[PDB]
Structures are given as C-alpha cells and as structure tokens.
C-alpha cells in the first residue's frame, strides 16, 4: 500500500472539499496520468467514511465510458486514496468560460446524450447518483463527458430513503424532494439533467432558488403549480401547502428559446412533475432529439 503511493508523483491540486483533496498525479513507472483523491481518515475517528464506502463499492461495478472510472483503491492505516481516470475540466467551469459565446448546440446535444448513457448505466445497475450538477460532470478535450462524484450515490435494490443532510445542491433538486417525498427514485437524476440541459442552452440556471420554498416557487412559476391532475398525490405530500400560489405554466418556447420542437419535447419529459411519468434515461436516449447526434470537441480554455 505504501509502495503504491510512492509510485505516484503529485502534479497539482485540482479539487478540494469536505471529502478531502484531489490531485492530478502521474504514475512514475507507467506514465499514466491520474486523479488521486485523498480522503483524510483521522479527522473524525469514525473509520472509513460512509461516502467513501458507497463511492468505492458502487463505482467498481460501474465501468462505462461516461462514468469516471475508479482505477484503484489504496487503504493505508491513516489514509485512503482512490485513483480515478483523469479528465480535463468540469462542466461548471466550461459553461462559465462559454458565457460569451454559448456552448454550441451540437456539443450540448452530445453532452446530454453521453450523460444519459452514463445515467442509464447507473440506473440499470440500481445506482442512484443523487448529486448531478455541472461541477460533478467532467469533460476532456476529445468531447467526452462523464459522471463523477458518487459521494451521495446509493444502491436501490431496496428503496432509498430521503435525508435532509444528504441532498443535491438546491438548484438541481427535484420537486418530489422539496415536497418531502419518502423515497428517492431514478427520476431525481433525470430532473437534475434536465435542469443542466436547460442551463447549457440558455446560459442561465433554470431554477436558481434562494431557499427550499423559493426553489419550489421558481419551479411552479415556470412549469405551473402542480395539482392532482398533473401529479396525482401532490396535495397529500408532506411539505405541500394549500396556500401555495397557483401559477400557470409558462410557454416553453420562451423558457428555452434556442431549442427546437424536439429539444422542447425532451426537456418537457425530463421535467415532468410526476416522478412515475418523468422520462427514464433509457427512453430519453431514444428521443428524436438525438437522431442526429455527433461528437464535437469543446474549446477548452486552459
């Protein structure tokens, strides 16, 4: 375990957070470039963190071109390293660097197509991601985009329960979750992707709420306040209030103006209120929107 670690040359820090730190690193023997995640294992004295337990066990079942590959795990006494395939950039930064020009629509399509393929693989292997947001989506110079950061991911061979402390950042959070649903379903990841799709197209976040209630209202104000006919059950859901303003559904061509009929169709189905009716990743892949998909390469400003 210590020899392995000595085979790595740390190049530069590319990520940091509560979880620990990620370095670009080089295998000194093979030359392979790699992302080294260091989890600090003395910080609490609670053993291997649950996020690491889940990320590792779930990620090694998930080998797919559009999921960032876990290459290796090194577990010493006081350190835990995960070795991931290395990508060039995250989508959040890319979108921000693309503000002036916009992400070209073909590249947007290619990205969504790949993310859906990656998501469909997750779900068809009973893994929920649960944290799909631009910064957790990684891209390379060849045009690939891949799901990353499975710190909140969960197997659902048995239904996954909702936790207040372990939720996606607000903007990409599905309405079920905001309304207090009991279990997560695959539909929450599809919702996040739809939000991200919209944000790539318009260059603004779709539903940038300030709080849980404000987030709901931004959703209601755009998609219309849901009722029993749209979403059988809404009014019974825990955090639903009858005092909710009843907004009408905004015209969808005015919500994502750049999008054609197929794109508007796909996004509508990804943002369907009723989780049972929200389109699955697999069915989305078959949507006519992706009829002509190609694989453009981004202009990565580095």
């Amino acid at each position: 375990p210590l020899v392995d670690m000595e085979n790595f040359q740390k190049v530069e820090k590319i990520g940091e957070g509560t979880y620990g730190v990620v370095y670009k690193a080089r295998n000194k023997l093979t030359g392979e470039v790699v992302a080294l995640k260091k989890i600090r294992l003395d910080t609490e004295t609670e053993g291997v963190p649950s996020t690491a337990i889940r990320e590792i066990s779930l990620l090694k079942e998930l080998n797919h071109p559009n999921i960032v590959k876990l290459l290796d795990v090194i577990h010493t006494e006081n350190k835990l390293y995960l070795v991931f395939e290395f990508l060039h950039q995250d989508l959040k930064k890319f979108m921000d660097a693309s503000a002036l020009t916009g992400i070209p629509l073909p590249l947007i399509k290619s990205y969504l197509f790949q993310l859906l393929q990656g998501l469909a693989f997750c779900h068809s292997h009973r893994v929920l991601h649960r944290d799909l947001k631009p910064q957790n989506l990684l891209i390379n110079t060849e045009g690939a985009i891949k799901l990353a950061d499975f710190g909140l991911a969960r197997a659902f061979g048995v239904p996954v329960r909702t936790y207040t402390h372990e939720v996606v950042t607000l903007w990409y959070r599905a309405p079920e979750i905001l309304l207090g649903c009991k279990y997560y379903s695959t539909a929450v990841d599809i919702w996040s992707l739809g939000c991200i799709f919209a944000e790539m197209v318009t260059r603004r976040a779709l539903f940038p709420g300030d709080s849980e209630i404000d987030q709901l209202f931004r959703i209601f104000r755009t998609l219309g306040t849901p009722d029993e006919v749209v979403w059988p059950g809404v009014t019974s859901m825990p955090d639903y209030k009858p005092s909710f303003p009843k907004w009408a559904r905004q015209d969808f061509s005015k919500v994502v103006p750049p999008l054609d009929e197929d794109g508007r169709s796909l996004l509508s189905q990804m943002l369907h209120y009723d989780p049972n009716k929200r389109i699955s990743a697999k069915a989305a892949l078959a949507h006519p929107f992706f009829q002509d998909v190609t694989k453009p390469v981004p202009h990565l400003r580095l």
Binding site: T45, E46, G47, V48, P49, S50, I53, R54, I56, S57, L58, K60, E61, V73, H75, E77, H123, S124, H125, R126, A155, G157, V158, P159, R161, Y163, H165, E166, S185, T186, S280, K282, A283
Partner: protein
C-alpha cells in the same frame, strides 16, 4: 419501474459472484454453524436496538459469510468480525450509521474501538470493498411489485422467513438469495392468501414452483420448527404489530406440492 427488469437480471448475476463458499464452515478449525447462528441472532437484536433497516442486517451477514469463507477465525474473534460487518453494513445502507462507540458498547467492551476499526479495515480488504451485495431482501422487494393486490401481511411473513434463513448456515448457504426469496415469498403468500408463486414471477425469474421446491421444503421446515429453535430474536422481532404479528401465524401443516 422502468429498469425493474434490467436490475433483476443484474442482481441475478451479482448474487452468483458475491456468493460465499458453501462448505466454508467445516474448514474453520474453531467456529461452527451454531456459533454463527448465535452471532446472527445477536445481530438481529442489535438491529432492533439501534433501529436498523432489515437490509443492513442481511448485508452484514453476507459480509460475514464471505469473510469467513476465506479467513480462519477463533471463537473469541467471531463477534469482532460480526461487529465490523454490522458497522460496514450500517455505513452502506443506513441513512447514517450509529457511531463506532455504539458498536463498542454493544459488545460489552469485549473489544476496543481500535480493534473494531482495524477489523473494519481488514473486512474491507478481504471483501475488496465489494459491499453492494444482492440480498434476500432486495429480491423480495422486486418480487413484491408482483402482488396483484398488494398485501402487507404477506410481505411481513416473507421478510420473516427470509430473515430466519440468515440464522442457519445449514441448509441455506447452499441456496441463492433469489431462490430463498422465491420460496419465502410463495410460502408467505400461501399461508396468508392461499395463493401460489404467480405466473408473472415464473416468467420474470424463470423459477418454477418445482424449481423452488427443495428450498421451499427446507424453509417450510424452518417455519414449523421456529418456535423450538434455540435462536429467537427474529420471532420476537416479528410478533410486533409493525410486522402484523406474522411470527404468531401458524404455518401450514403441509405445502400443496
């Protein structure tokens, strides 16, 4: 569900891979089925104390059978293995695990916190972090979607039988989780509603009633003898109203097979 099928197919593949060695207990110098039975019974009790999901319990046992399948352990260490297994199972399945301190407490401080963390490390190494194993519970869940009218009493009784099968390495090590679930499901459906393994699950699982028979016979026998069994924590757990008192239900005298 939309992936319901792909997930079943996949669980059916993983359950073959994450499967312990059937004959591992006779290759253990010092421990025995009876001791494992006592350990699993204890873990059910612990699960009840800290109010843990049933899935946690099944995962912990799967980790233990895999660990013991390749590592010799002495009596005095068996419980440290199971304690670490439960901790890992909790970390994996629970919304948030009990603290390590709690797992040291539940052992009467037989082991130090340090021994628990080191054993957790060892178990992770020996299982190679492959913790997302298929369980009877997971297959039962998939199966339950196939009750035309959903019945909560059938589900409790199926859980109850599936949970009992964890206790006795003989004969249940020799059966796949999907098979134990199939037998527990039909048996619970049969006792409660008088109906049998449904054709829709025959098509889904490829298991016939004929195919389930050997496990059915065993499971029925474990159901009959349950009140006599030396381990009782599960029967206790399942006479609570949370489970419709299904462990009080009288098993059929014979299956109509």
């Amino acid at each position: 569900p939309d992936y319901h099928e792909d997930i079943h197919t996949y669980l059916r593949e993983m359950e073959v891979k994450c499967k312990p060695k059937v004959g591992y207990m006779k290759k253990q110098p010092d421990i025995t089925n009876s001791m494992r039975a006592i350990l699993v019974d204890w873990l059910v009790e612990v699960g009840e104390e800290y109010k843990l999901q049933n899935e946690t319990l099944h995962l912990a046992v799967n980790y233990i059978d895999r660990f013991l399948s390749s590592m010799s352990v002495l009596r005095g260490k068996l419980q440290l293995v199971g304690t670490a297994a439960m901790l890992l199972a909790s970390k994996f399945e629970e919304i948030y695990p009990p603290e390590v301190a709690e797992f040291v407490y539940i052992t009467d401080d037989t082991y130090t916190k340090k021994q628990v963390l080191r054993m957790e490390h060892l178990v992770l190494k020996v299982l190679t972090f492959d913790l997302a194993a298929p369980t009877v519970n997971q297959f039962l869940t998939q199966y339950f979607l196939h009750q035309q009218p959903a019945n909560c009493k059938v589900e409790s009784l199926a859980m109850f039988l599936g949970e009992l099968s964890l206790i006795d390495a003989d004969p249940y090590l020799k059966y796949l989780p999907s098979v134990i679930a199939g037998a527990a499901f039909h048996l619970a459906l049969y006792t409660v509603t008088g109906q049998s393994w449904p054709e829709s699950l025959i098509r889904k699982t490829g298991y016939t009633l004929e195919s389930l028979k050997p496990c059915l016979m065993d499971l029925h026998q474990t159901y009959l003898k349950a009140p006599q069994h030396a381990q009782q924590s599960i029967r206790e757990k399942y006479k609570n109203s949370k489970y419709h008192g299904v462990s009080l239900l009288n098993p059929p005298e014979t299956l109509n097979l």
